[PDB]
Write an enzyme that holds these catalytic residues in place. Structure first.
Site, PDB file in Angstrom:
ATOM      1  N   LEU A  44       5.318   3.360   2.550  1.00  0.00           N
ATOM      2  CA  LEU A  44       4.945   3.330   3.960  1.00  0.00           C
ATOM      3  C   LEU A  44       3.529   2.813   4.160  1.00  0.00           C
ATOM      4  O   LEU A  44       2.914   3.051   5.199  1.00  0.00           O
ATOM      5  CB  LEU A  44       5.061   4.730   4.565  1.00  0.00           C
ATOM      6  CG  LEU A  44       6.442   5.382   4.553  1.00  0.00           C
ATOM      7  CD1 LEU A  44       6.365   6.816   5.056  1.00  0.00           C
ATOM      8  CD2 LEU A  44       7.417   4.569   5.385  1.00  0.00           C
ATOM      9  N   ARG A  46      -0.497   1.776   2.179  1.00  0.00           N
ATOM     10  CA  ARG A  46      -1.457   2.255   1.194  1.00  0.00           C
ATOM     11  C   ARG A  46      -2.824   2.513   1.811  1.00  0.00           C
ATOM     12  O   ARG A  46      -3.001   2.436   3.027  1.00  0.00           O
ATOM     13  CB  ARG A  46      -1.603   1.252   0.048  1.00  0.00           C
ATOM     14  CG  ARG A  46      -0.408   1.178  -0.883  1.00  0.00           C
ATOM     15  CD  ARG A  46      -0.570   0.043  -1.878  1.00  0.00           C
ATOM     16  NE  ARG A  46      -0.810  -1.236  -1.216  1.00  0.00           N
ATOM     17  CZ  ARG A  46      -1.062  -2.372  -1.859  1.00  0.00           C
ATOM     18  NH1 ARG A  46      -1.107  -2.391  -3.184  1.00  0.00           N
ATOM     19  NH2 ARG A  46      -1.269  -3.489  -1.176  1.00  0.00           N
ATOM     20  N   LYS A  48      -7.266   3.360   0.194  1.00  0.00           N
ATOM     21  CA  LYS A  48      -8.180   3.285  -0.939  1.00  0.00           C
ATOM     22  C   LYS A  48      -8.065   4.512  -1.836  1.00  0.00           C
ATOM     23  O   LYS A  48      -8.568   4.516  -2.960  1.00  0.00           O
ATOM     24  CB  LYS A  48      -9.619   3.141  -0.441  1.00  0.00           C
ATOM     25  CG  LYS A  48     -10.039   1.709  -0.163  1.00  0.00           C
ATOM     26  CD  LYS A  48      -9.941   0.857  -1.421  1.00  0.00           C
ATOM     27  CE  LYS A  48     -10.771  -0.411  -1.302  1.00  0.00           C
ATOM     28  NZ  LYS A  48     -12.217  -0.111  -1.113  1.00  0.00           N
ATOM     29  N   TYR A  49      -7.401   5.550  -1.340  1.00  0.00           N
ATOM     30  CA  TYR A  49      -7.312   6.801  -2.081  1.00  0.00           C
ATOM     31  C   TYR A  49      -5.885   7.149  -2.491  1.00  0.00           C
ATOM     32  O   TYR A  49      -5.674   8.051  -3.304  1.00  0.00           O
ATOM     33  CB  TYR A  49      -7.899   7.951  -1.257  1.00  0.00           C
ATOM     34  CG  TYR A  49      -9.335   7.740  -0.838  1.00  0.00           C
ATOM     35  CD1 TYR A  49     -10.348   7.639  -1.782  1.00  0.00           C
ATOM     36  CD2 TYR A  49      -9.679   7.644   0.504  1.00  0.00           C
ATOM     37  CE1 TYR A  49     -11.663   7.445  -1.402  1.00  0.00           C
ATOM     38  CE2 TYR A  49     -10.990   7.451   0.895  1.00  0.00           C
ATOM     39  CZ  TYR A  49     -11.979   7.353  -0.062  1.00  0.00           C
ATOM     40  OH  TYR A  49     -13.287   7.161   0.323  1.00  0.00           O
ATOM     41  N   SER A  50      -4.907   6.438  -1.938  1.00  0.00           N
ATOM     42  CA  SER A  50      -3.511   6.798  -2.166  1.00  0.00           C
ATOM     43  C   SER A  50      -2.497   5.707  -1.829  1.00  0.00           C
ATOM     44  O   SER A  50      -2.776   4.795  -1.046  1.00  0.00           O
ATOM     45  CB  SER A  50      -3.166   8.057  -1.368  1.00  0.00           C
ATOM     46  OG  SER A  50      -3.240   7.805   0.025  1.00  0.00           O
ATOM     47  N   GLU A  51      -1.318   5.815  -2.435  1.00  0.00           N
ATOM     48  CA  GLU A  51      -0.160   5.035  -2.022  1.00  0.00           C
ATOM     49  C   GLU A  51       0.817   6.008  -1.374  1.00  0.00           C
ATOM     50  O   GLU A  51       1.064   7.087  -1.910  1.00  0.00           O
ATOM     51  CB  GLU A  51       0.497   4.361  -3.227  1.00  0.00           C
ATOM     52  CG  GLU A  51      -0.475   3.690  -4.185  1.00  0.00           C
ATOM     53  CD  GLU A  51      -0.025   2.302  -4.601  1.00  0.00           C
ATOM     54  OE1 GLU A  51       1.188   2.112  -4.828  1.00  0.00           O
ATOM     55  OE2 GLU A  51      -0.887   1.403  -4.710  1.00  0.00           O
ATOM     56  N   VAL A  52       1.376   5.636  -0.227  1.00  0.00           N
ATOM     57  CA  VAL A  52       2.234   6.558   0.515  1.00  0.00           C
ATOM     58  C   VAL A  52       3.686   6.093   0.567  1.00  0.00           C
ATOM     59  O   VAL A  52       3.970   4.955   0.932  1.00  0.00           O
ATOM     60  CB  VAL A  52       1.704   6.777   1.949  1.00  0.00           C
ATOM     61  CG1 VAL A  52       2.636   7.680   2.735  1.00  0.00           C
ATOM     62  CG2 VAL A  52       0.297   7.357   1.912  1.00  0.00           C
ATOM     63  N   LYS A  67       2.452  11.312  -0.966  1.00  0.00           N
ATOM     64  CA  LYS A  67       1.164  10.638  -0.995  1.00  0.00           C
ATOM     65  C   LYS A  67       0.591  10.727  -2.401  1.00  0.00           C
ATOM     66  O   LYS A  67      -0.072  11.701  -2.753  1.00  0.00           O
ATOM     67  CB  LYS A  67       0.215  11.278   0.021  1.00  0.00           C
ATOM     68  CG  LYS A  67      -1.162  10.649   0.102  1.00  0.00           C
ATOM     69  CD  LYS A  67      -2.045  11.412   1.080  1.00  0.00           C
ATOM     70  CE  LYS A  67      -3.433  10.800   1.172  1.00  0.00           C
ATOM     71  NZ  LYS A  67      -4.342  11.602   2.041  1.00  0.00           N
ATOM     72  N   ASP A 155     -12.643  11.969   9.825  1.00  0.00           N
ATOM     73  CA  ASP A 155     -11.969  10.677   9.762  1.00  0.00           C
ATOM     74  C   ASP A 155     -10.966  10.509  10.904  1.00  0.00           C
ATOM     75  O   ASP A 155      -9.845  10.045  10.698  1.00  0.00           O
ATOM     76  CB  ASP A 155     -11.285  10.493   8.407  1.00  0.00           C
ATOM     77  CG  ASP A 155     -10.961   9.040   8.109  1.00  0.00           C
ATOM     78  OD1 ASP A 155     -11.600   8.150   8.712  1.00  0.00           O
ATOM     79  OD2 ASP A 155     -10.069   8.785   7.271  1.00  0.00           O
TER      80      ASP A 155
END
Ligand code: ANP
Ligand code: CL
Ligand code: MG
Ligand code: MG
EC number: 2.7.11.1
Length: 329
Positions: A44, A46, A48-52, A67, A155
């Site tokens: 769904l 991406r 800088k901290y994760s791929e979802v 996540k 954020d």
């Protein structure tokens, strides 16, 4: 001389009155499930901290979101986890369903309740005056709850607000930058997206608080009612303050710096100059007029202030006349 200290106006000491384990996330012990309970369907997006990924829980065939965290400090992972666990059950807060680890790569992954958000790129131009009021009120519910729980989101931006327009559900997500508030703590100012960074972040004032989230919310609202995304479109962190200065004026800015005795980076010297505080009518036109109202502008004015202590608190905002049609319903 040194910068002048600052405390939060509300929810100042809520973390001090709680057990150490509540906010001492470093000492939190994570109980892992098995990632074989889940199968990935599709990605769904991406960051800088994760791929979802969208995924399925094979134990009960329910749709979830996974996540997978890109290698950051264990501290930052425990922080996101502890905060999500603390905020569980709260209004408009995303729900953490499980925490798993890849047997092979040992990469930690978070499992969330699934939300079907229509993209804001296509959504924020289909919203009526009421819809904007309605969803803004929903975000405020989330912000007031997490602040009362001693937590700064840090954020707030459209990408981190998932909206199910069909069922009118809203969920605030991405708590990877979230942090516990402690009176007198000096935080990292390099957080949040450029376009939503508060003045305190741009001038490097470390002793900020919950009110940072309120600035970001103001930026969202501004872009929505004026149909201008982003509202403050800076080229970098320095030009970002300049972009803001051309609207809120330079007078209040230099007064803000003086009040907190902030040492302003020599780079700002030549680039700020002198600017008057503009009236909001300048950003109004036939395309956005139906979304702009005296109440909308009055509310917006009270969010976008240099002085973080001068901004509305989440609760105060929910009591503003701008939300009267929402509260009546
Ligand atoms: N619970 C969810 N349900 C459906 N989609 C989600 C969910 N959580 C995240 N996403 C999607 O994944 C994207 C990024 O997720 P996010 O939790 O913000 O990871 P991230 O790396 O922290 N993003 P960012 O930190 O802002 O660069 C979002 O923009 C959504 O489109
Ligand atoms: Cl000017
Ligand atoms: Mg995000
Ligand atoms: Mg994030």
């Amino acid at each position: 001389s040194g910068p002048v200290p600052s405390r939060a106006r509300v929810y100042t000491d809520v973390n001090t009155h709680r057990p150490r384990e509540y906010w001492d996330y470093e000492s939190h012990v994570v109980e892992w499930g098995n990632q074989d309970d889940y199968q990935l369907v599709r990605k769904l997006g991406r960051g800088k901290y994760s791929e979802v990924f969208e995924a399925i829980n094979i134990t009960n065939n329910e749709k979830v979101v996974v996540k997978i965290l890109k290698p950051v400090k264990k501290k930052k992972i425990k922080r996101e986890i502890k905060i999500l666990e603390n905020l569980r059950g709260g209004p408009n807060i995303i729900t953490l369903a499980d925490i798993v680890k890849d047997p092979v790569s040992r990469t930690p992954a978070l499992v969330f309740e699934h939300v079907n958000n229509t993209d804001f790129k296509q959504l924020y131009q289909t919203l009526t005056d009421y819809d904007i009021r309605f969803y803004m009120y929903e975000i405020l519910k989330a912000l007031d709850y997490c602040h009362s729980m001693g937590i700064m989101h840090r954020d707030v931006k459209p990408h981190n607000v998932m909206i199910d327009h069909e069922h009118r559900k809203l969920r605030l997500i991405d708590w990877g930058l979230a942090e516990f508030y402690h009176p007198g703590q000096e935080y990292n100012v390099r957080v949040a997206s450029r376009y939503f960074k508060g003045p305190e972040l741009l001038v490097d004032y470390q002793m900020y608080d919950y009110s940072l989230d309120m600035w970001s919310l103001g930026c969202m609202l501004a872009s929505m009612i004026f149909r201008k995304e982003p509202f403050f479109h800076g080229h970098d962190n320095y030009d970002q303050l300049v972009r803001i200065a051309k609207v809120l004026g330079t007078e209040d800015l230099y007064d803000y710096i003086d009040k907190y005795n902030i040492e302003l980076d020599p780079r700002f010297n030549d680039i700020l100059g002198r600017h008057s505080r503009k009236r909001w009518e300048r950003f109004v036109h036939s395309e956005n007029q139906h979304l702009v109202s005296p109440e909308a502008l009055d509310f917006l004015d009270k969010l976008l202030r240099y002085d973080h202590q001068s901004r509305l608190t989440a609760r105060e905002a929910m009591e503003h006349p701008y939300f009267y049609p929402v509260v009546k319903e």
